[PDB]
Amino acid sequence: ALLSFERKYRVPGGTLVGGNLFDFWVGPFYVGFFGVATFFFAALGIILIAWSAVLQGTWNPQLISVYPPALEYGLGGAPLAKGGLWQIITICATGAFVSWALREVEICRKLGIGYHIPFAFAFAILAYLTLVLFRPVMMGAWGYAFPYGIWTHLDWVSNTGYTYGNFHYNPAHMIAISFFFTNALALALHGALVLSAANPEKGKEMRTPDHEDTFFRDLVGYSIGTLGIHRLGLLLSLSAVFFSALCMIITGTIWFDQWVDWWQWWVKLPWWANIPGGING
Amino acid sequence: AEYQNIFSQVQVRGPADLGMTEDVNLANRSGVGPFSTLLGWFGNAQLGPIYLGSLGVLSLFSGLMWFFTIGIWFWKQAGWNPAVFLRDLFFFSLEPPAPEYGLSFAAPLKEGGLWLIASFFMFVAVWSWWGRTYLRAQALGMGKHTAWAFLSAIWLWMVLGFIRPILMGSWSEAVPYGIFSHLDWTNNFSLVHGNLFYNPFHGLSIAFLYGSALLFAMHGATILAVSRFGGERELEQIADRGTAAERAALFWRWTMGFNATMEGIHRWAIWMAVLVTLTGGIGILLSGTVVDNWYVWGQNHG
Amino acid sequence: DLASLAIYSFWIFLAGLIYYLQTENMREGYPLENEDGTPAANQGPFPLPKPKTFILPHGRGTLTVPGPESEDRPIALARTAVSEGFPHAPTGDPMKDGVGPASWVARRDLPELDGHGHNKIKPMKAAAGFHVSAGKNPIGLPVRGCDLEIAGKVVDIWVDIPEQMARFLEVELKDGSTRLLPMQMVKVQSNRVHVNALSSDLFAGIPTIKSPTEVTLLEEDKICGYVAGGLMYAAP
Ligand code: BCL
Ligand code: BCL
Ligand code: BCL
Ligand code: BCL
Ligand SMILES: CC[C@H]1c2cc3[nH]c4c(c3C)C(=O)[C@H](C(=O)OC)c4c3nc(cc4[nH]c(cc(n2)[C@@H]1C)c(C(C)=O)c4C)[C@@H](C)[C@@H]3CCC(=O)OC/C=C(\C)CCC[C@H](C)CCC[C@H](C)CCCC(C)C
Ligand SMILES: CC[C@H]1c2cc3[nH]c4c(c3C)C(=O)[C@H](C(=O)OC)c4c3nc(cc4[nH]c(cc(n2)[C@@H]1C)c(C(C)=O)c4C)[C@@H](C)[C@@H]3CCC(=O)OC/C=C(\C)CCC[C@H](C)CCC[C@H](C)CCCC(C)C
Ligand SMILES: COC(C)(C)C/C=C/C(C)=C/C=C/C(C)=C/C=C/C(C)=C\C=C\C=C(C)\C=C\C=C(/C)CC/C=C(\C)CCC=C(C)C
Ligand SMILES: [Fe+3]
Predict the structure, then answer these.
(1) What cofactors does this protein use (chain C)?
(2) Closest approach of chain C CAs to the CA of A188, in angstroms?
């Protein structure tokens, strides 16, 4: 049930809603009003997915797929068997996600720590809403959102990207891939460092952070520090996702042509625009 | 507002830190460079010293060579005209020898011979730099986690341009040094092998890449959340657990049923990331050599 | 074919990896317990790992985990329901008793040492070569609280020598004594330092230190745990 040091922390209080009505655990899980909320949404949406599984005539996971309304219904409602189910599931999905975040907030208040976690979560939720809600409403049709299927949604990606040629050419999609690639390099090193310090050569004394900072100077000439590196990772992460919601919010809205052609503004610059030779002309 | 600790409210400076010594040959450490109020807002403000030493020079040199070898070719293409250079910067490119030359080292400069050279330097610069990360660890009595991690990355890099091209038969199969150039290569690789999505290792790799951002985002926020109990001082909390380590663990326990320890989380961390280039390396290595179309393969698995 | 074969291998590997990983994170806090402090019946499918030992530097001894877990302190709490999973109310003063958001761990009563064996943290006055190189300098600023009244004045800045970081603010109180506040818990401003978690009257309650030239891991925890609790408990 409890971790050896858990009891002193399980005091009452912290809840945003319901006072103490739902202030209590269930095994290791904390509940709280929002814990109920998310349960409600999560269950409901699962039922609907099962319902959708019948209309499609299959219970196979690699096949089930709740597609959104066809483009003809614009942003209006649609029949259950033809996009309606997706719209309701999207709602439960979002209801579940918000409740979950708000749940971490209560868990935050009870433990007396900072709200960085829930806060960071919200960025993920945001990326999700971009793809299923903001981009579609801005393109006037639920049909632009992605389908809920293991591979079908992968298709949505493939096709959506190729609709504009090599999507690699999306400037914001380029910045995003940078934070993603970086976050992992960063992550790989932070863990490698801390561990190499707490697990020195066999028989040696547990190194100190001073050895950690030394190692990075002896190597690259600079060391961001124990607090900095934790600041850095959070940043890279959220950045990579921020540039990801961006890159898509613009695709199909402000810009709907080939992504490669967007790069001509550069080459057309008067100065080099007409010069002969080189790659362009 | 309630101070979020993303930035320091006040900086503080003291003398330059020459760093721990151990079995390090101090004859090689450079000089304590300046400080930086800018950087000092986010993390450390002290710049340097750096331990150069033999191997470091080899790479640093062997590295610039690779970099210039390419910059030159770009000029050759730029027609030496600086405006052309700047304009078509992202467009230039140094491609590898034509299929004909196969795996021979006979191709002439303007046929992949130049690519071969640059590649050579690269191959030295990186590998030498790898040993450097192993020694700097060793001179301080630290584990070699960093060397083994950097290796996983070398794996993929080593597969993309050295292994697979050799198993295929030519220097053609490798990646061209160029910005937009190497982006197309990628898009192409996919198309030619029947859509990489159908490649299991690929879908796996992505999984971890996503995992890394998920995890680092989690780990990062947690630590700042309990930095009011001196949480960032991870090593000590590992030696002698404090409230920072307890509240940190409990927040997750209550949220998702389980949790980690101040020394365990970093073990997740290093593996989550490392696997990204571990799994990816495999997927690319099989592509072309064993499997030809992942779609077709995805149909029977034989 | 190799591909089909490379993948099963991988999953099997991946499973061992997760296994290893989970057990390693069980080095602290386990075995589970019941609300009464007795070993719980169900311990999960994962077994505890073979212990490992840390050779602490500066001959500070050793450490082996997993090991005997002891809170080594009284916990002034009491059940609120006859069943499992409910809150445990504070029998006394939560802030004083150090329970809930005011909790603290009974860590060693020694100070953390830089790689040279010297104290990692020292008031700036005792730190030769250190000074405020950027941002508003608090030494001299009056501290204010939850209730918007005066509680004292900053009289120094305790700093982390090896990491060159401001970690605490020594504040002199009305009776002429000083206390330490966590850097991460104060809002520095042009003319005043603001403290939300605590209100003036609670300031005097902040656990005080022995040596006036150092803090021990135990004292850091009591000081921090206390301030952090004010957020919930200062309320009135
Ligand atoms: C062939 C197709 C195109 C292409 C088309 C696209 C398209 C189209 C899109 C991307 C997007 C992305 N692409 Mg791309 N992309 C290509 C090639 C690449 C290459 C490469 C090396 O070639 C890379 C690195 C990338 C990288 C990326 C990422 C930067 C980005 C997706 C991450 C993200 O937004 O997460 C954000 C995270 C989320 C949206 C998830 C949120 C999770 C929610 C909050 C919670 C879910 C909980 C779950 C239901 C609960 C389970 C509980 C159980 C108990 C377990 N692309 C090619 C050229 N790419 C996407 C993007 O930017 O999206 C905004 C996007 O739409
Ligand atoms: C994995 C599949 C593909 C691939 C797919 C992609 C895709 C898809 C994208 C990139 C992008 C990039 N790739 Mg790649 N890339 C591959 C292999 C490589 C190899 C190699 C040795 O094998 C290298 C050096 C690179 C390098 C790069 C960078 C130039 C650029 C990403 C910035 C970044 O965040 O880097 C992570 C590393 C660090 C942050 C640390 C090192 C610092 C780097 C070297 C700094 C680069 C600065 C840049 C050139 C500055 C431009 C400034 C101008 C004023 C605009 N790639 C393989 C073959 N690459 C992105 C881009 O924007 O391309 C145009 C992008 O969208
Ligand atoms: C960001 C751009 C595209 C996209 C592009 C891709 C691409 C490209 C790939 C994936 C892949 C995956 N995607 Mg996706 N994906 C998108 C949006 C989503 C959303 C969402 C709520 O919006 C979800 C739940 C997922 C989920 C998934 C996983 C099934 C799988 C990756 C493993 C992984 O490590 O993930 C990161 C998360 C973790 C490590 C945390 C653990 C959480 C696990 C994985 C959750 C599984 C949930 C299950 C599928 C949903 C069950 C519903 C029940 C009601 C509970 N994607 C958007 C629309 N996705 C990979 C794959 O292998 O696909 C077959 C892959 O290559
Ligand atoms: C249209 C093209 C295809 C596609 C084709 C490919 C191909 C082809 C490949 C990938 C690969 C990857 N793809 Mg893809 N990919 C697509 C769509 C996606 C989508 C999406 C949402 O649509 C996503 C999330 C991804 C995601 C990913 C990554 C998981 C993976 C690369 C990991 C990495 O870190 O590499 C970057 C890291 C490295 C290259 C590490 C090596 C670094 C070396 C050692 C350092 C050199 C340093 C230099 C000397 C120093 C510079 C520093 C100086 C200071 C300047 N792809 C589409 C469908 N993808 C790669 C992979 O592994 O696949 C299995 C790969 O080969
Ligand atoms: C924004 C920055 C990054 C980030 C951060 C992040 N994620 C987080 C947090 C944070 C800070 C959490 O605190 C939270 C957590 O608690 O993690 C353990 C979480 C979390 N990130 C998760 C997933 C996740 N994060 C992702 C990404 C990212 N997370 C970013 C890289 C991805 C990707 C890359 O795709 C995924 C899958 C969850 C495991 C977890 C939050 C769990 C949660 O909210 O659970 C309760 C909700 C349910 C049980 C919902 C079911 C709802 C519906 C009824 C059914 C499903 C509908 C859905 C549309 C189906 C999709 C099917 C697919 C096949 C397409
Ligand atoms: C899970 C695997 C992840 C990973 C891990 C990883 N990378 C690593 C490591 C690890 C564990 C290292 O230890 C190593 C490192 O040293 O990091 C700091 C490294 C490293 N990862 C690097 C890059 C890198 N990693 C990438 C990716 C990844 N790395 C994955 C996400 C990528 C991508 C996304 O493409 C890149 C580009 C290198 C920076 C670095 C290894 C350095 C190296 O090999 O150097 C050889 C030396 C040179 C090439 C020197 C010349 C450099 C420039 C061309 C010239 C200009 C510089 C000069 C100093 C200017 C002077 C100007 C004057 C005016 C003064
Ligand atoms: C202003 O101009 C100057 C000249 C001053 C400098 C400017 C320089 C510039 C502008 C340089 C630009 C270079 C760029 C943009 C390079 C980009 C490279 C990219 C995007 C990707 C690289 C992919 C490469 C990987 C896959 C390479 C792997 C290489 C190897 C595994 C080694 C190859 C091995 C070989 C050939 C074998 C040699 C033989 C032996 C002994 C084993
Ligand atoms: Fe950490």
Answers:
(1) a bacteriochlorophyll; a bacteriopheophytin; Fe cation; Mg(2+)
(2) 16
d(Cα B298, Cα B282) in Å, to the nearest integer? Answer: 17
Residues 6+ apart with CB under 8 A from A183: A233, A236, A237, A240, B212, B213, B216
Q: How far apart (Å, rounded) are the C-alpha atoms in residues C71 and C107? A: 10
Does A190 appear as a known binding residue?
yes
Q: What are phi and psi of C89, to 5 degrees?
A: -70, 150
Kindly provide the residue ranges of all beta strands, DSSP E only, lying in A86-193, ordered along the sequence: none
Resolution in A: 2.7
Whole-angstrom distance, CA of residue B253 vs CA of residue C47 = 18
In eight-state DSSP terms, residue C50 is: P
What is chain B's length?
Answer: 302
Q: Please state, in angstroms and rounded to a whole number, the distance separating the CA atoms of residues B138 and B51.
A: 13
What residues does C53 pair with on adjacent strands?
C64
Q: Measured between alpha carbons, how far is A195 from C29 in angstroms, rounded to an integer?
A: 20
Fold of C107-236: Photosynthetic Reaction Center; Chain H, domain 2 (3.90.50)
Q: Cα–Cα distance between B215 and A183 in angstroms, integer?
A: 10
Q: Residues in chain A, how many?
A: 281
The ranges assigned to domains in chain C are 2-106, 107-236
- CATH class of the structural domain B1-143: mainly alpha
Check whether A39 is labelled as a binding-site residue: no
Strand runs labelled E in C29-107: 52-55, 62-65, 77-79, 88-90
Q: Mind giving me the DSSP string for C191-211? A: TEEEESS--HHHHTTSPPPSS
How far is ligand 5, taken at its centre, from the CA of residue C101, in Å?
A: 28
Nearest-CA residue for ligand 3 atom 38 is B211
